[PDB]
Structure formats: structure tokens, C-alpha cells
Amino acid sequence: TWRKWNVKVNHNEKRYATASAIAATAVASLVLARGHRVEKIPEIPLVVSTDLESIQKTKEAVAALKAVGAHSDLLKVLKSKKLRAGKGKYRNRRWTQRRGPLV
Amino acid sequence: AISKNLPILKNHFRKHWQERVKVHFDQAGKKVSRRNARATRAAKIAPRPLDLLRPVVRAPTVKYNRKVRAGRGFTLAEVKAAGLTAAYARTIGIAVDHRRQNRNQEIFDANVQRLKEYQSKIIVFPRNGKAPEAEQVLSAAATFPIAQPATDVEARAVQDNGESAFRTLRLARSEKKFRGIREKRAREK
Amino acid sequence: GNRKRPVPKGATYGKPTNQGVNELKYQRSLRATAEERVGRRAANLRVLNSYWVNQDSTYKYFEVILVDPQHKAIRRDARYNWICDPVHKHREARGLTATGKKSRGINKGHKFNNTKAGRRKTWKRQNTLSLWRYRK
Amino acid sequence: AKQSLDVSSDRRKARKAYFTAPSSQRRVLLSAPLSKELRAQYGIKALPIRRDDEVLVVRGSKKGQEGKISSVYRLKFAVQVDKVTKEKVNGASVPINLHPSKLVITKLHLDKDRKALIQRKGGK
RNA sequence: GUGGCCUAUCGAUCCUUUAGUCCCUCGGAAUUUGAGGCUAGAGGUGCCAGAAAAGUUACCACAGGGAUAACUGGCUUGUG
RNA sequence: CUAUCUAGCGAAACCACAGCCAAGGGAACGGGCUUGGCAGAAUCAGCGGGGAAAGAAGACCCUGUUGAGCUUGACUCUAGU
RNA sequence: CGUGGAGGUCAGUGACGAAGCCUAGACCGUAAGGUCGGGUCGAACGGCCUCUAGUGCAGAUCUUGGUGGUAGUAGCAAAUAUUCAAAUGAGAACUUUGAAGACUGAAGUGGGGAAAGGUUCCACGUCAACAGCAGUUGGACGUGGGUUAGUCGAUCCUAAGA
RNA sequence: GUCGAAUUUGGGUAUAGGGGCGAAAGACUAAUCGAACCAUCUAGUAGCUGGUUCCUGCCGAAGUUUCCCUCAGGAUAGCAG
RNA sequence: CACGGACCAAGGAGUCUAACGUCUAUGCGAGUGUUUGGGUGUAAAACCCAUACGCGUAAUGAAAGUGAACGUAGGUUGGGG
RNA sequence: UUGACCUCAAAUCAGGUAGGAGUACCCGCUGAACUUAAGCAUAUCAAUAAGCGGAGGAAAAGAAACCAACCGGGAUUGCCUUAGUAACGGCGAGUGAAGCGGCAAAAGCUCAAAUUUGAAAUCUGGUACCUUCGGUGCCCGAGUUGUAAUUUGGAGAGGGCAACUUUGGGGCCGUUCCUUGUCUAUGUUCCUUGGAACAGGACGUCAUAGAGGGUGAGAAUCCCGUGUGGCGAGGAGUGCGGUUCUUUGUAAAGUGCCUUCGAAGAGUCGAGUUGUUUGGGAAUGCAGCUCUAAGUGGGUGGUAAAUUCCAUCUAAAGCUAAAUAUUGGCGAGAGACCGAUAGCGAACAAGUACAGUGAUGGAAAGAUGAAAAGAACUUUGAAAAGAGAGUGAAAAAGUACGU
Ligand SMILES: [Cl-]
Ligand SMILES: [Cl-]
Ligand SMILES: [Cl-]
Ligand SMILES: [Cl-]
Ligand SMILES: [Cl-]
Ligand SMILES: [Cl-]
Ligand SMILES: [Cl-]
Ligand SMILES: [Cl-]
Ligand SMILES: [Mg+2]
Ligand SMILES: [Mg+2]
Ligand SMILES: [Mg+2]
Ligand SMILES: [Mg+2]
Ligand SMILES: [Mg+2]
Ligand SMILES: [Mg+2]
Ligand SMILES: [Mg+2]
Ligand SMILES: [Mg+2]
Ligand SMILES: [Mg+2]
Ligand SMILES: [Mg+2]
Ligand SMILES: [Mg+2]
Ligand SMILES: [Mg+2]
Ligand SMILES: [Mg+2]
Ligand SMILES: [Mg+2]
Ligand SMILES: [Mg+2]
Ligand SMILES: [Mg+2]
Ligand SMILES: [Mg+2]
Ligand SMILES: [Mg+2]
Ligand SMILES: [Mg+2]
Ligand SMILES: [Mg+2]
Ligand SMILES: [Mg+2]
Ligand SMILES: [Mg+2]
Ligand SMILES: [Mg+2]
Ligand SMILES: [Mg+2]
Ligand SMILES: [Mg+2]
Ligand SMILES: [Mg+2]
Ligand SMILES: [Mg+2]
Ligand SMILES: [Mg+2]
Ligand SMILES: [Mg+2]
Ligand SMILES: [Mg+2]
Ligand SMILES: [Mg+2]
Ligand SMILES: [Mg+2]
Ligand SMILES: [Mg+2]
Ligand SMILES: [Mg+2]
Ligand SMILES: [Mg+2]
Ligand SMILES: [Mg+2]
Ligand SMILES: [Mg+2]
Ligand SMILES: [Mg+2]
Ligand SMILES: [Mg+2]
Ligand SMILES: [Mg+2]
Ligand SMILES: [Mg+2]
Ligand SMILES: [Mg+2]
Ligand SMILES: [Mg+2]
Ligand SMILES: [Mg+2]
Ligand SMILES: [Mg+2]
Ligand SMILES: [Mg+2]
Ligand SMILES: [Mg+2]
Ligand SMILES: [Mg+2]
Ligand SMILES: [Mg+2]
Ligand SMILES: [Mg+2]
Ligand SMILES: [Mg+2]
Ligand SMILES: [Mg+2]
Ligand SMILES: [Mg+2]
């Protein structure tokens, strides 16, 4: 049990990686290369109204994402659900799917 | 088992050390339980600040005597100078220590000031039972922080009397070394 | 007297550093031994204290103070009903009496670093390897 | 997703609780949905299945057949319909086991206790 | 002229002891004893780069060795 | 009475691959390699030349900073007295 | 290069057949290996970018399990001995009955017990396994039945001793 | 060989591991005795024997020096990447 | 004519940990280290933080102790650019 | 003679209590060797394994005879650090703490030693009754060889003067905590494949519910659940939020000034010696034997001793939550863990079958199919079975059963 499990990372270098990741989200070439369906989205990064934060229902939340151009990415997650290909199925990891938009 | 140019090692693993290995897997778990314990205690105890008032004391030893910190409790003389008894102070949220003594006037005055400020910023509800509702402040140390006393102003005038600071230290060191022999020499005459 | 090592014919079957038989001393005092045997004799009582009364060449004599935890004069007495708690059963067996704490070295100061809070617990603390999630 | 600390998502624990469930607990597990006519009349979705209930088969090779529930074989997690059997080669007839989730209740056998259950669920 | 005309004639750590410096420390502050340090020698390890050490086993044991003896065989032929 | 043949029943040891010789060279005594002699299916009962046959990590001998039993004014101790 | 598992991706393959297995059939790579067709089969699995390890076997008089040559071979030879007929049965050198020939020869191959075994005792039914051939027989297999005390023992007494 | 006794033997009982018991063989003490059996310390130590699992590419040795209760082993310098 | 190997399948041997040397990559740099702990949370993750402490920034003596610019931080010779 | 007291007995006297189990963690005693030192005896392994005694939900420790030398800190425990450091060691191999600093948690206290003496004011038990984890009355007994009140070193006490300030115990109804019940969304609509749709295609719906499981193949919407809330039932503890019944009491407590006092633990401290132990080194702790104190005293101040100072506490009597530990027990949630020669010895009637006189030792063994639908009937054979027929998506699934 006394094998090392957690790894310590310098706090400043950790923030360096986070800043680099944020900047990469504004490059359309990298976002498309990562599999996201943003071909028909005109401007990257995408900024929406602050009224999105006050949405209570899932039905209207999906509609708001639908109207901004994230429909293709939402559909990609639904059609990508698959069964895992090994012994992990009976270790509480049974289904795998893709990653959608981050709000 | 000695070869090459390597530092000498002193690893102490010639006992049954594997039977006494303690890995802190529950570091995150204990933090959650400590926060739960503090939350349950605060809701149960009273609207009182969950911690007692502490005095300001000088740290011992020549290495740390330049700083002040929080001590155990207020002395009997400090409590008396604030205008209340030790028995009543303990029931009001003030830590009292009976073995600490007062030898410095600056520390004594600062601690008396803390007690006076504390009495003016609390409401003691009567034993009758009315208890008008008040918000609970979770910390009494943050309400009354401890600050390092100021030592000197930013700038002054140069005042040199011609004596060397290095010479003064040398003379003080030498005079202590030969005090015993000089007393013996004067005693024999 | 001393405590002779109970080995047959004096043979120890070991290194010469452990071949001593006759000059060995029991780590508990004779006063502690007196309390233990009285405690087993009256197992319905609790040992409180004991004191020296007399001695000769062969024997040392002691008188042991015992408190009945079932008597209503004790259970209703606020100053002595603490002894009725189950945590105080056979105090003399675990060295919780005055003579027991003396032989355990339960005192304050630099002279008792080995036995301040239990010799074996201190040894466990000083011989334990502590590892955190983020290794120091 | 799961939001409570008392409920478990472990597959091993969930399957053990199903196969080792006691007789009283299997009654709830053997529930069947009501028909369109009964749901409008009663205002509830599904009920635990009972003997002497009229059912309709909506899945499997016996789809479209009707009958009364003759036995609720809780030990086998199945129920039997009087008119749904199989003829063996020797001439003997044996019932066919059906799962209540593949059935639709067309008529309910009523009594004092089931009327209270319908009302306790908000039905009329 | 910094021992013997030249080429051999000899000895670490720990400990003890002597000489020197009369210097440093005994850590709450001093004096005097005592003890501990600093520099240079002596007391010895001859298995001489320096463990403190008697036999027996035909009652025997284990790890190995053809790196190695008690048969053949091979090389050799003093001897026969 | 066996062996032998028949009916029924039915193991084991052992096994790198295998199984004809002469000389040569070779880890200095080959079933295999080199040069020669030779060499024809499938087999049965006997047989003890060979397979340096099988049975055991040589009990002899030596080595190891491996033991044990026993002995003694070896070294260091000890119950008893 | 290959294996178990993990993050991301190919909105990858699949009951119109995934994985595995067999295949002197085809193709690629110097090689570790990769790919395809055919047969068998029935529910999951792969390419690429990275993470991780209980990650690759011909040997260790290796571990566990399975299987050979030997080989239808060694052998199934102590205790004197068997033979005829009938009955039963699908089947009789071995079961039953009768007849004959023999042996143990009273310190027995006879008739009872102690220790130990525990139903082996008895009847009915029955032969896959067991009785190193055989079997209709059995101390086998299945199902039942059976042990009756004031006088026989235990129980009581004491022995060495505990 | 011995066969009326230092005879043979059942049952009861006593002696337990550095101990027992021995008309004495180091014999016997449950197929175990020049110190029984069982579990644990224990995955005891081994300078000694055996084994140590995929491919290709490039480079490529040493059995010598000094010291060691050193002579079947290490340290050290050399050779190699 | 030295040892293991009759055959086949599956299993089967440089691992992890504490403290370190060289080399390399990364962050910051006379500084550096958020994760003992506290705050916070979509809850063993991620995010935020005070005071200390460790190492480094001064060495040298057994110790009491003392403590690093004569000068464009020196002269000479060889030095890439 | 009789009646007491003291000491010692008896009873199947009245009422109680102790043992054994478990033992992961906890408090003590006792106590090795293998091993390392390339041999080996001191040392090391180790103040460990085994053995023995005793507890709890934690235990133990704990309100300084402490640490310090500072401008002093201020019960105990744990974490980070001090530190592989001071020191110990055939000064070899090796071993090795503590004060300060940051943090977690925080809580304080009471007996002995005093004449109530104008009043033993105290307590067990018996008995009657009641508002029954108890109360009142009465009666024996205990106890003056000392039971209450009052005071514990921070103090405090006996007198004198002078001032104001402050309450106690239950019921009932909520709240908090625990154990439980119940209710609370949305397709099984078409086409294709198939034995089975839970697959593919088309058209929808719910979502604070697309965790998980079941159902004849990959099911948010078929079933149980999941998410968000509502409504109940049974207990615990007075933690506290409102009401309600009692006035506890010529009671209790706190505070100023003056005066006189101020009791504080003995075969113990300490010393010598022996053994053991520690980093503790002219001796760290513990124990045996011998000696054996003091009251402006005593202990400590890490080098033995004599002399003169200073600093700091108050031993030889006692209680006490939390931060800490936990391969046992009970209830839960999880995994870059193993996947039937693996993982616990045991996924199964596993500590089972079986072996040993005994202590003990100790396996192998999971998978027909969605559903037995487990093969009627005919024929050959003494029979086991065979050949047909039949069931099934498949007998290239036949209870010797997936592949
Ligand atoms: Cl899938
Ligand atoms: Cl012949
Ligand atoms: Cl290739
Ligand atoms: Cl015994
Ligand atoms: Cl110096
Ligand atoms: Cl000493
Ligand atoms: Cl288990
Ligand atoms: Cl046994
Ligand atoms: Mg001369
Ligand atoms: Mg000369
Ligand atoms: Mg001193
Ligand atoms: Mg030499
Ligand atoms: Mg040779
Ligand atoms: Mg000649
Ligand atoms: Mg030949
Ligand atoms: Mg050969
Ligand atoms: Mg030829
Ligand atoms: Mg050998
Ligand atoms: Mg041998
Ligand atoms: Mg040697
Ligand atoms: Mg020996
Ligand atoms: Mg296939
Ligand atoms: Mg082939
Ligand atoms: Mg299947
Ligand atoms: Mg492996
Ligand atoms: Mg193999
Ligand atoms: Mg190999
Ligand atoms: Mg083998
Ligand atoms: Mg034969
Ligand atoms: Mg024979
Ligand atoms: Mg015969
Ligand atoms: Mg005869
Ligand atoms: Mg005759
Ligand atoms: Mg019979
Ligand atoms: Mg037979
Ligand atoms: Mg037969
Ligand atoms: Mg039977
Ligand atoms: Mg006899
Ligand atoms: Mg002899
Ligand atoms: Mg090993
Ligand atoms: Mg080359
Ligand atoms: Mg030497
Ligand atoms: Mg060799
Ligand atoms: Mg060999
Ligand atoms: Mg072999
Ligand atoms: Mg393998
Ligand atoms: Mg009685
Ligand atoms: Mg050794
Ligand atoms: Mg060795
Ligand atoms: Mg040895
Ligand atoms: Mg133990
Ligand atoms: Mg308990
Ligand atoms: Mg606790
Ligand atoms: Mg306690
Ligand atoms: Mg005190
Ligand atoms: Mg403290
Ligand atoms: Mg030690
Ligand atoms: Mg001891
Ligand atoms: Mg206590
Ligand atoms: Mg297993
Ligand atoms: Mg098939």
C-alpha cells in the first residue's frame, strides 16, 4: 500500500499548463483537431449572454445551446455511447462516450 | 558493500519496519470530518465564537524573543486590572492562566487593553432567558488580531559619539571573562 | 530478595550476556506484589492504595485499602463513585496505583523521556515510518 | 446521476440484492403497467401483479394472447397465465413462465386493500 | 655536520601515559581540586595495512569441488 | 511348480534424440563427426559383451571465515557448594 | 514488435455473427509480427495519440494438471483337489441341490469370549461400480427387520497410583 | 538356541526431550534417535550449485597492478559503453 | 564416456520503498518549495491561502572566537565572437 | 451471677459481587534465537516474537517538585519540524532522543493535614406508604480509633469595619439526533433482421431523474429504482426554542479595607552498592539489599568534589471530555486491484471430505438452453444401448451438457 500514488507538481508550473490550455481553446484549428464539431460556428471563442446563468430547466438549457451552434457537438455525444472493451465492464466502468462542450 | 565515490548513508531499516508503516490515505477524509465537527459544535454550543480569547506574550529564547504570539491565558493580575474576577472571566469566554507572571509593563498594558476591548464588543445575555437573537461570529481570534509592536520610526538623525561599536562588544566580552580573577586578585590584597 | 530466573539447573541456552541467574531484580516493587495478591483474593473490591507497616529478614508487611463498588454508600458518594466506573477494574493489575505509576516511570521532566506517556507507546511512535499522499 | 450517500451504484451489490431478495420484496419487483383504458380510469401507471388479474401479452412469441393470472411464481420471478401453455410430445400440458414487465393489466381484481393502494397513489 | 661511507635493521584507529602551550571547555554565575580538548612522543600488533581463541569424531551432518587426493585410460621412461 | 502357448485381467523402472562396426582425431576409451568395411520388410524363444545400463545432488578426499556429538587447567561464563 | 488495464479520439466493428479456436490457402515486414479468405462458434471487440504494469519461457532432478513409448509386456505359480448330473438364468470351471473323491484330525480349517470394529447379523429386491479371472453369488448395491434381566456385567470396595 | 525359571504374557499404573529409560548396543522413547514429534520466530543466512521469458542496429572486453584471516570472494587501477 | 531435459498445456524469476551520486527535461531564480494545516468544492479530484520550517545566499577553528576589494574585483600567457 | 467491650468464628442466614469468551487497537510483567558485524564473545536483531496478568469504545497520559537562561514560556495527547542532529558504540558494525517554532484540539480541578463542640449537623439496611433509575415517616445498625459543612497553595482561614450585585427544582408543547414507512416524470408509436428487439431506421416525450439493476441480445422514456420534495410512526437525550406549576430563603455566592495567622503527604526523599535498561556519557529510568533525612526546607538547573550566590518549581495522595490508535465486531460507500492453477485455504452442503494416538495438518470441485420444451411413439437387443421419430434458433447444446 505504501507505493506512491499521488504526484506533487510545482504550483507555478501547474498554472502554466492551465494558462496554455485556456489559450488553446481560442484556436479553431486545435478545437477541430480535438474532435469537436465546431465547423459551422463563426467566431471562436464563443461568448453568450449572462442570462444563461439563470436557466432553471434542462429543456430550455438545451434549447439555448441549440440556438448558439452547439447542436452538432451535443448529438455527437449521444451517438458515441459504447460498451467498454475489457474487464473494466464489471469494475463499475461499463459505458464510454465522448466529451461535449464546456460551459 | 562499499564501492565508488558516494556519500555515506545512514538508513535505519534493520528492524521490522514494515509492520509499522503508516500511510495517510485518509488525509482528505479527516479534513472533511474536522470541518463537520466544527460545524456541529458551533451550531450546538452557543452563538459564542467557538474559541476563547487569548493574550499576547513574548516568545522565549534569544532566537525567537523578537516576536510576540498568542499565549495560554490572562494572568490573575491582568484579569483583576480589567475589572472582573477570574471565576467570572472563565464563564464569559476568556482564557485564564494562573501560573504565568507579569514582569514587563508593556506586555501587561497590552493584555489589559485586549480585555477592555473584548468587553466592549460582546453582549452577555441575561440568565432570565430572553436572549435577543444575534448573529454568530465563528472566530474571536480574527476579531482581535495580534500585531507586532512598533520598534522605531522610519528615519532619524545620525548621532555618533566616536566610540566604536566593535570596540564596545570586545570590552564587554573581555570584562565578563576576567571578572572572577580580578575579584580574587583584589580580595587577596 | 531478588527474583531467581526460573530455569532448570541454571542453563539458559543462549549468549553469555543472558546467562545471569542469581543477581536479577524484579521490575515491580514488593509493594506492588502485595496489592496484586490481595486484589485476586477480593475480586469484588477495588484497590485504592497501600502502605508499609513492618518488615523482617524474610518478609515485608503491607496494609491494602479496598473500596466496595457495589455498596450504596460508595455509589451515592460523589467523591468516591468514580471508582465504580468499569474503566477502573483491577487498577493494581495495570499499574494505575501510586506504586504502579512509580515503577512505570510516569513523571515529568527530562529524566523521564523514555516513559513520559508509556514506554511502549513512545517506542512505537519513534519507530513508525510516516508517509503522506504527497511525499515529503 | 446519483446524489445520495446511502444509495450504491455498485453492480455487484445490485445483482446480489435482486437474486437474494425475500418473498415480500419480490412482490414489488413483479409489477406490471396498466392498460390505456385502465390508466385513464384509475390515474396510475403500474401496480404489483396479483393472482386472478386479467393480463395481455405485448412482447415475445405469445404476443396478443389474454387470460387470467393463475399463479405468481415469485421463486422463479415469473407468472403463469391459464390460457398460455405448451403441449408436450406425450400430451401433457405445462404452463409458460412470463415476466410481468412484458404484460399489460386489462382488468384488476379488487378488494379493500387494493382500493386503498389505488387511493394512496393518488388514483380514483 | 639534521646520526653510523652507500644499499636492510621495523608499526594505524581505540585506550593509557609523558612533554609542550599554561592556552580552550565543564553550557544559570564564580574560585579551587578533578575531568575533558589542542600540538609532539612512548606502551604493539613478526599472520609485520595491525580479529582476543585447544583437541577429537571409526556415531556423524550440510553446501560444493574433478579448481584437488585415493582405480583405469593418456603424455613421460628416471627406475624396472 | 514355473518359464512356454491360449482365454480373461493387466502394472512399473526407465526414456535429449536414438540404436551395426574398424581406425583416426577429439575433454587423451564414439551410436552420431572423418576415412573405410558395409547395408533388405515384419519377427519369436533365450542370453548377460556393450549401452562408461538403472537405483542416490559421493558416505572416502579436499574446499567453506557451514554445523553437530564428545573431551580437556583452550577462551568466556554458570547452577550448586 | 507483442500483452493486461487507464485518459482522449475515430459520432470505429458487431446476432445480416464480436471474441476464441482450426486451416503443407493468399499478401506485407530483414525480424519481433501484422493483414485477408475458408471452416467452427455465439456477445462483445479494435485502429491511432498518450498513461500504467503482477507485460513476452524450452530448460530451473521447476509447480499443478493431463498424456505416451515401454506393453497386451512383467505377471495373476505358498497353504495336497477336484469330478459328474440336474435346477436357475440372455449368459455357469466359480450360484443352488444331489452324487463321488479329499482335507482340517480335539494345542482343529470345531464350539465360545476379551480388546477392537459398528450393523458387517437376518430377510426381500437387485448386478453399473467393488470381490487384481468370472459371477445369476457376496462382509457389495437398494429397502426394511432385529439386541427384552431383582439373580449375567456395569454400578459398590480397595491395589500400585491419581 | 532355550524350554520351571534372572521364565513368558494380558490389563492397570509410574517416568517426557539436554529429559526419560538402559544386565550398556549410543541402544530404545509410535516405520523418526550421537538429542522425538508439532506449530511459530522464518521468505533464518549462504563468498556455494541451478535457473533467469521479444526482434533488429551500432560499439565492444578481462583473467593483469596494490591492499585484505586475501587464495571458489571483495576493494583499487586498467581495459569497455 | 560431464550435468538438467520422455511428452503437452497453463503458471513461473531485477520488484516496491526510505535516503542519495552523475546526467537530462521543466518551472521560477538570490531565491525556491501551495497540498502539516486552513479556505472552498460539481466532494479522496479541481481551485485559493497565512505563519513557520527545510535547503541555498559565508567560511574557518577541538574550542572560546573571528569573519572575505591596495587596484576599472589585480598582473601575465593562450582564447570564440 | 448478669450485662457490655475487643478479637475471632458459624449458617442452604438478607441482599450482592468475581470467574469464562473476545483480544485489531490499549495498560503491565516476562523474554529469546536466527540474523548483522563478511570469523566471534560486548554490541546488533530487540527493550522485538513466543509465554503471563488486566481494560475500554477508545485506552493511557494530564492541570508542573515542567521547560528554560529569554524582553521568558505555562496541563496532557497528536501532526510538521528540530534530526539521522546532541549523544551512545570491539568510537567497529551500528544506534539516537529533547527544549524552542507552526498547527489540530482545548477544561478544569479535590482530598489529607483545623474544635460542629450552644448540640454527628453524616450514612447502609429493615418496614409502611407514595408522585418508584427515587421520596417521606418510623425503627435497628455503622460511626467520635472521626461520618457532614467549611479550606487545597492560583491560595485560604479566624476576628473588625463598609457596601451594593446575583438564583432553585420539575411538567407540557416544539427543535435537534437516531431507528423506519409511504407518496411524488416521460413511447413499449411505425419499418427491417431475429426464436426473442433490449439491435438498425423513422417520428416523439421527460430531465434538479441519461447512477445502477432486471426483463427471451447494447432499454433515460417496459419494471424496480434514480432526482426533487411532501406527509407519517416509534424512541433517545434536557443540548435549547416557547409556554406552564412551584418560591426555593431571616438560604447561598461574589467583591473592598485593617489586623493576627497561614496546619501542605517518611522506611519516603536522598546516599552507597548490585543487576537491568536508556542517546543520557564519574552513572537516564526501574528494582533488590544496606543506611536513612529536613522545614527560610526540599527537588531540578545533562562532568565528579569543597565554598559562596542566583534561577525555577512544590514530590513521596486523587479525578477529568476533545484532537490520537484500531488486520477484531456491527453497519455503509468505493477501486487505473484479481477474474476459477488468479483472488482469502474456501465464488460450491470449506475449515468441509480425508490423514494422524495426539498437538496439528488440510484439498479438489463454478458455465445445457430464453424456456426441460430433459427426447412421446416405432423397431433390434436379456439388458446397457443402437437405428428412426420428435423438441429446439442450434442436439456441431442430450443432465459424461457453452466455446
Ligand atoms: Cl456497444
Ligand atoms: Cl528357441
Ligand atoms: Cl514487421
Ligand atoms: Cl510431554
Ligand atoms: Cl577558532
Ligand atoms: Cl558509569
Ligand atoms: Cl470467505
Ligand atoms: Cl498429526
Ligand atoms: Mg665511521
Ligand atoms: Mg649518511
Ligand atoms: Mg551546568
Ligand atoms: Mg598483511
Ligand atoms: Mg583436473
Ligand atoms: Mg634402464
Ligand atoms: Mg568403434
Ligand atoms: Mg553413446
Ligand atoms: Mg560413413
Ligand atoms: Mg555432490
Ligand atoms: Mg550428499
Ligand atoms: Mg577464505
Ligand atoms: Mg559449533
Ligand atoms: Mg467470428
Ligand atoms: Mg497444422
Ligand atoms: Mg449468450
Ligand atoms: Mg511475472
Ligand atoms: Mg513450458
Ligand atoms: Mg533458457
Ligand atoms: Mg521435469
Ligand atoms: Mg505373460
Ligand atoms: Mg510369481
Ligand atoms: Mg495351492
Ligand atoms: Mg496333513
Ligand atoms: Mg487326514
Ligand atoms: Mg449375511
Ligand atoms: Mg474381477
Ligand atoms: Mg465382471
Ligand atoms: Mg448398502
Ligand atoms: Mg516377561
Ligand atoms: Mg561405539
Ligand atoms: Mg528468496
Ligand atoms: Mg567492431
Ligand atoms: Mg588482518
Ligand atoms: Mg564455480
Ligand atoms: Mg553439477
Ligand atoms: Mg535425466
Ligand atoms: Mg505461459
Ligand atoms: Mg442466603
Ligand atoms: Mg557473523
Ligand atoms: Mg557471511
Ligand atoms: Mg558462525
Ligand atoms: Mg507477544
Ligand atoms: Mg465491551
Ligand atoms: Mg475519541
Ligand atoms: Mg482514562
Ligand atoms: Mg497545582
Ligand atoms: Mg505544554
Ligand atoms: Mg536499541
Ligand atoms: Mg527485563
Ligand atoms: Mg488517571
Ligand atoms: Mg482457489
Ligand atoms: Mg450454434
Side-chain angles (χ1 to χ4, degrees):
Chain A
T1 54
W2 50 85
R3 176 192 310 203
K4 187 179 63 177
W5 307 102
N6 299 74
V7 187
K8 179 178 301 183
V9 176
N10 291 6
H11 197 4
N12 184 258
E13 185 174 335
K14 182 176 298 184
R15 290 169 167 169
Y16 199 137
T18 308
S20 296
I22 296 176
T25 63
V27 178
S29 183
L30 299 180
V31 178
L32 281 170
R34 223 205 69 85
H36 294 287
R37 310 302 162 89
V38 297
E39 302 86 355
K40 301 183 303 178
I41 296 183
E43 188 174 23
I44 297 295
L46 177 64
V47 183
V48 304
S49 176
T50 321
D51 298 323
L52 181 66
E53 302 175 355
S54 297
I55 285 184
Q56 302 289 149
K57 300 289 293 184
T58 301
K59 182 177 182 179
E60 52 171 350
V62 175
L65 271 57
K66 173 77 176 299
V68 85
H71 171 61
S72 186
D73 217 28
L74 297 187
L75 183 60
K76 182 248 301 173
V77 183
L78 293 184
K79 317 293 284 185
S80 67
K81 188 178 182 181
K82 290 286 190 180
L83 198 67
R84 193 173 287 266
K87 292 194 183 62
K89 287 189 298 302
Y90 41 89
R91 296 187 183 180
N92 302 323
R93 307 180 296 271
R94 196 168 185 84
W95 302 99
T96 62
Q97 60 183 14
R98 301 293 82 87
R99 310 286 288 267
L102 175 66
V103 178
Chain B
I2 315 176
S3 184
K4 301 154 192 168
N5 183 18
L6 292 169
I8 307 298
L9 298 177
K10 299 189 72 174
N11 298 315
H12 291 225
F13 298 100
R14 286 164 188 80
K15 305 179 183 182
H16 288 61
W17 62 274
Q18 290 179 108
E19 301 175 356
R20 294 174 296 269
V21 180
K22 173 62 181 181
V23 187
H24 299 267
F25 288 119
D26 57 338
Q27 182 183 16
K30 281 181 170 296
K31 186 181 181 182
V32 175
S33 65
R34 284 195 301 269
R35 288 174 57 86
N36 286 335
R38 288 191 289 266
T40 56
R41 183 170 184 258
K44 188 265 302 183
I45 182 176
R48 59 171 157 164
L50 193 72
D51 65 332
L52 301 180
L53 183 71
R54 306 291 173 172
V56 183
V57 301
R58 277 288 177 182
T61 298
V62 73
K63 177 178 179 177
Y64 294 107
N65 63 342
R66 58 187 179 95
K67 295 180 178 179
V68 296
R69 57 166 174 85
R72 171 90 182 183
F74 296 85
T75 69
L76 303 180
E78 283 170 359
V79 162
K80 188 175 184 179
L84 34 75
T85 63
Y88 179 79
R90 294 192 183 277
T91 66
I92 217 61
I94 300 176
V96 178
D97 188 10
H98 61 78
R99 57 185 79 96
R100 184 167 62 89
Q101 303 299 309
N102 288 117
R103 313 172 197 85
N104 183 18
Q105 183 74 228
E106 277 66 31
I107 296 295
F108 178 83
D109 287 335
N111 282 328
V112 172
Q113 183 64 212
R114 289 176 63 84
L115 296 172
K116 295 183 177 303
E117 296 172 353
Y118 178 82
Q119 294 182 239
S120 64
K121 297 192 179 63
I122 65 171
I123 286 85
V124 182
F125 301 108
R127 297 170 61 174
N128 175 82
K130 175 58 182 61
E133 187 65 25
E135 187 67 25
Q136 185 183 27
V137 188
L138 288 178
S139 182
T143 305
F144 301 93
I146 298 181
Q148 307 295 322
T151 303
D152 199 322
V153 306
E154 285 71 19
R156 279 184 294 102
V158 179
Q159 294 180 347
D160 191 9
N161 59 280
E163 184 64 33
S164 173
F166 178 79
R167 180 68 173 179
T168 297
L169 294 174
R170 291 293 292 174
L171 287 181
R173 186 186 310 271
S174 175
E175 190 262 337
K176 174 179 176 297
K177 182 180 180 180
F178 295 95
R179 184 196 63 169
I181 181 63
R182 284 168 175 170
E183 285 181 349
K184 178 182 176 64
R185 187 181 298 109
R187 190 263 296 179
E188 289 182 338
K189 80 178 183 303
Chain C
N2 299 335
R3 177 193 180 270
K4 182 176 180 178
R5 202 195 294 271
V7 295
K9 305 177 184 179
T12 60
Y13 305 103
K15 298 172 181 178
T17 182
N18 298 324
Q19 286 189 7
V21 178
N22 279 288
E23 285 175 315
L24 311 181
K25 279 78 182 184
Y26 184 39
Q27 289 300 330
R28 306 190 74 184
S29 64
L30 300 177
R31 179 181 167 193
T33 302
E35 296 178 358
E36 294 268 17
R37 290 177 180 171
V38 172
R40 298 195 306 267
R41 177 67 170 274
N44 58 309
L45 308 180
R46 300 295 182 271
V47 176
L48 186 61
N49 264 324
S50 63
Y51 51 89
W52 180 96
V53 286
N54 211 323
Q55 63 179 358
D56 57 69
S57 177
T58 308
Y59 305 104
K60 281 188 182 178
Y61 302 79
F62 302 94
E63 289 189 353
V64 184
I65 304 172
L66 301 164
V67 184
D68 187 13
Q70 284 83 34
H71 204 284
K72 294 302 180 181
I74 301 302
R75 299 171 71 89
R76 298 168 185 169
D77 193 2
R79 290 185 181 92
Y80 286 96
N81 59 3
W82 64 268
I83 198 59
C84 304
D85 194 288
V87 82
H88 295 287
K89 289 186 295 192
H90 288 281
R91 299 166 76 250
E92 78 293 340
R94 294 172 290 155
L96 297 183
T97 58
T99 177
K101 301 174 74 65
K102 175 61 173 59
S103 297
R104 291 164 60 202
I106 306 295
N107 282 113
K108 290 183 174 176
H110 61 278
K111 295 177 172 301
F112 306 95
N113 287 337
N114 288 319
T115 62
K116 261 184 193 67
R119 174 171 63 82
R120 288 175 184 82
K121 194 174 84 172
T122 303
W123 183 86
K124 290 183 182 64
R125 201 211 312 114
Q126 298 170 347
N127 290 266
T128 298
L129 185 63
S130 180
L131 300 178
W132 293 88
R133 298 190 303 166
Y134 302 95
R135 297 298 163 92
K136 297 174 172 294
Chain D
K2 176 174 74 70
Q3 298 296 332
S4 174
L5 307 179
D6 300 325
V7 49
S8 176
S9 298
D10 181 63
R11 174 181 172 90
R12 173 182 173 182
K13 291 182 178 181
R15 278 175 55 85
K16 179 176 178 59
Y18 169 78
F19 291 111
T20 61
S23 177
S24 62
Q25 211 280 333
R26 297 191 180 193
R27 172 184 161 274
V28 181
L29 297 178
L30 298 176
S31 301
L34 304 188
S35 64
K36 300 308 171 188
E37 298 79 7
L38 287 193
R39 172 155 71 159
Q41 179 184 359
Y42 292 135
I44 52 180
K45 183 70 181 64
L47 285 174
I49 203 171
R50 194 200 186 275
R51 195 178 71 258
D52 200 65
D53 278 359
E54 276 284 348
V55 297
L56 167 63
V57 188
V58 296
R59 283 297 193 274
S61 298
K62 298 298 179 178
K63 188 188 306 177
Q65 298 187 19
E66 296 179 345
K68 269 183 171 299
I69 296 297
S70 58
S71 175
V72 182
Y73 217 142
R74 295 182 182 176
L75 192 69
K76 293 177 175 299
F77 289 108
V79 302
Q80 294 177 352
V81 185
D82 53 356
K83 291 189 175 62
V84 183
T85 54
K86 178 177 177 57
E87 288 75 15
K88 299 183 60 180
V89 59
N90 57 7
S93 184
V94 288
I96 296 182
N97 296 332
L98 297 169
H99 199 263
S101 64
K102 302 294 167 291
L103 303 174
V104 162
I105 300 179
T106 66
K107 188 177 183 299
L108 283 172
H109 176 261
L110 289 179
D111 51 1
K112 284 188 177 299
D113 289 331
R114 294 191 92 183
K115 287 178 183 181
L117 173 59
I118 294 179
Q119 297 181 359
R120 192 164 69 255
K121 281 181 160 53
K124 63 184 184 62

